[PDB]
Design a protein around this ligand. Structure first.
Ligand SMILES: COc1ccc(S(=O)(=O)N2Cc3cc(C#N)ccc3N(Cc3cncn3C)C[C@H]2Cc2ccc(OC(=O)NCc3ccccc3)cc2)cc1
Ligand SMILES: [Ca+2]
Ligand SMILES: [Zn+2]
Lengths: 324, 311
């Protein structure tokens, strides 16, 4: 029952030109300064959404490549910003960016691989950094990073698979760690992981697909788990998962699109989490990526696994087979 | 407008300077209490600033080397209070909960009963906080709490109010532990079916019971093996769902469950009704029409294979 009612004067058209303006001008501010702890991922969101809109040229390649090199530490891991600590999350984001720019040798690739390898535990899981937080999000960061570098063989894949499958639940979904409740975010990471490692046959697509399609609320928007409010990012986590497992047609595409369009800001540009709220580049990537998966012609095809243009992944030849 | 909006450019400068000072101190090798002071000021409002949790850990690790058991024990207790105050402001930050786990994991005689109460408290506040449930499973393992005790905790949480997806989920992991094989025993299954049925007849709009019931429906031994008791219980559930359908004609969960029960009972004998229920449910839940067609196609295939197995 918990849902948002879309007011009738909410945007119903794709304002692409305003979004590229929004991202192009992002980082010229309060919220900017306070999110320095995720800056590398922020940069990934901006560059990827611009590249899906064909506007990547408007961003600053040379300045981003210097920033990335300065964020690699002696252990091989990459931080979110200068002076911050290395983490799998930002190592992935950096590698995705360098992949968008065909500039992977900007960093020491052998050292990134050693970093990722070092974070794997005996049970096959990954810690996000040296402080040991275990989350299936990090299993995905690890194999996605390695898949993009051609180095998946560097880790114990069978053990990594065993761990992820140990996080599968009664409802077909996945949580953070064994016994954790299903959540769209972790489902996205784990189905992405199983795509990369070629294990989608181990997913119960009919059961999980039903759980995911029941995320769609009367409003058209998708939530991340039962009895929660819909929002644009959950809308990407759920749709991407459904695509990987071959069940995208189990949601009402037209109602979802309308929800996503209603999250745009007609004046300032970008998308927010829900209609009329404050935009940010994160929900802008996921709204845009969501619409592309839904078929929108003005946006380049996006990989549901890597959330990057398919043409980029075609070029590096990392294109995991999906269910259907 | 001018007071509050302006206030945060002042708050920004404090966070800006405190952050500067923390990194200054850190590059200097000054792993001391002043870093704990500065980070407490930033982490309270901004607990997702991971690097500052790392600095706190580096300070505590260092200080434990050059302080007495008593002084170290006092730092730990101050850290527990800091963490609790942070969780009160933002109970959903990964960083805060992990720091607590990191902290408790390295203590010599940690107090897990107390931590289980912190969990029960945060779960009273928000019964769906998955960080808290995750922390509770961590604490239950560390303290070697038996599955039966956690099972008793979930039941109480089931009946006091709604928002039960998290508690049903936990039951689905605990039940197989109380009967650990390398698929529930029918006696256990029957008790669970009675509990869930109570739940969804009490509140027919809450999806969590219906999701869990769907799982229980598959968790047995097969329709060819139906006991007279299980056969009778499922038939009774069927009639009770039809009753609920009369009261709530647009309740989609009871209609879906009717189809699933007929499947669990006798797919071919109920073929006609199954088809009728599919048309009704699709009209009641149009967003799920594509799912419902694929499920129907699946069930028809199943039926064809049953019919062809005929002698
Ligand atoms: C606006 O206040 C917040 C609150 C929480 C955060 S967060 O650090 O905990 N994080 C990032 C995040 C960023 C923005 C922006 N811009 C907005 C929200 C947000 N949230 C908060 C949130 C989002 N939806 C509901 N809420 C409450 C949470 C979180 C989101 C996040 C962070 C890192 C992520 O990284 C990955 O999972 N990476 C794996 C990956 C990477 C690329 C492709 C595929 C998988 C993904 C999502 C940030 C700002
Ligand atoms: Ca440029
Ligand atoms: Zn969101």
């Amino acid at each position: 029952q918990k849902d948002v009612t879309i007011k009738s004067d909410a945007p119903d058209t794709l304002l692409l030109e305003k979004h590229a303006d929004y991202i192009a001008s992002y980082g010229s501010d309060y919220e900017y300064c306070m999110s320095e702890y995720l800056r590398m991922s922020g940069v990934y969101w901006g560059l990827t959404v611009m590249d899906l809109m064909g506007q990547l040229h408007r961003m600053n390649k040379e300045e981003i490549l210097v920033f990335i090199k300065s964020c690699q530490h002696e252990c091989g891991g990459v931080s979110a910003s200068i002076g911050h600590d290395p983490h799998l999350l930002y190592t992935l984001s950096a590698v995705q960016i360098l992949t968008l720019y065909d500039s992977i040798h900007v960093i020491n690739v052998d050292k990134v691989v050693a970093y990722v390898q070092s974070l794997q535990k005996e049970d096959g899981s990954f810690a996000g950094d040296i402080w040991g937080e275990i989350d299936t999000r990090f299993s995905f960061c690890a194999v996605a990073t390695l898949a993009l570098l051609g180095k998946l063989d560097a880790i114990n894949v069978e053990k990594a698979i065993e761990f992820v499958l140990s996080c599968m639940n009664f409802d077909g979904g996945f949580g953070c760690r064994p016994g954790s409740e299903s959540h769209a975010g972790q489902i996205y990471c784990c189905t992405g992981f199983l795509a990369i490692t070629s294990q989608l046959h181990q997913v119960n697509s009919d059961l999980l697909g039903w759980w995911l399609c029941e995320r769609q609320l009367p409003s058209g928007g998708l939530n991340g788990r039962p009895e929660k409010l819909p929002d644009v990012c959950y809308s990407w986590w759920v749709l991407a998962s459904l695509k990987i497992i071959g069940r995208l047609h189990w949601i009402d595409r037209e109602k979802l699109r309308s929800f996503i369009l209603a999250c745009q800001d007609e004046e300032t540009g970008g998308f927010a989490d829900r209609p009329g709220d404050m935009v940010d580049p994160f929900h802008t990537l996921f709204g845009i990526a969501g619409l592309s998966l839904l078929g929108e012609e003005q946006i380049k095809p996006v990989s549901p696994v890597f959330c990057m243009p398919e043409e980029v992944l075609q070029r590096v030849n990392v294109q995991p087979e999906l269910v259907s | 407008a001018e007071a509050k909006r302006l206030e945060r450019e002042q708050k920004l400068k404090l966070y800006q300077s405190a952050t500067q000072a923390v990194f200054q101190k850190r590059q200097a090798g000054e792993l001391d209490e002043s870093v704990l002071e500065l980070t407490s000021q930033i982490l309270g409002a901004n607990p997702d600033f991971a690097t500052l949790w790392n600095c706190r850990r580096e300070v505590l690790q260092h200080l434990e080397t050059e302080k007495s058991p008593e002084e170290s024990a006092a730092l730990v207790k101050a850290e527990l209070g800091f963490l609790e105050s942070c969780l009160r402001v933002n109970p959903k930050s990964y960083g805060t909960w992990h720091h607590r786990c990191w902290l408790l994991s390295r203590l010599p005689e940690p107090n897990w009963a107390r931590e289980l109460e912190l969990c029960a408290r945060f779960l009273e506040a928000d019964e769906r906080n998955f960080h808290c449930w995750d922390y509770r499973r961590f604490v239950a393992a560390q303290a070697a709490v038996a599955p039966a005790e956690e099972l008793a905790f979930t039941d109480s949480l089931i009946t006091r109010n709604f928002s039960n997806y998290s508690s049903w989920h936990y039951r689905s992991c605990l039940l197989p532990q109380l009967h650990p094989q390398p698929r529930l025993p029918e006696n256990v299954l029957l008790k669970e079916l009675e509990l869930v049925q109570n739940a969804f007849f009490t509140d027919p709009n809450d999806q969590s019971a219906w999701f869990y019931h769907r799982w229980l429906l598959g968790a047995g031994s097969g329709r060819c093996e139906l006991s007279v008791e299980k056969s009778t219980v499922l038939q009774s559930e069927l009639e009770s769902c039809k009753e609920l359908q009369e009261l709530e004609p647009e309740n989609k969960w009871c209609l879906l469950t009717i189809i699933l029960l007929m499947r669990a009972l006798d797919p071919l004998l109920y073929e006609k009704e199954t088809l009728q229920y599919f048309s009704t449910l699709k009209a009641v839940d149009p967003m799920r029409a594509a799912y419902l067609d694929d499920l129907r196609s699946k069930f028809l295939l199943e039926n064809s294979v049953l019919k062809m197995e005929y002698a």
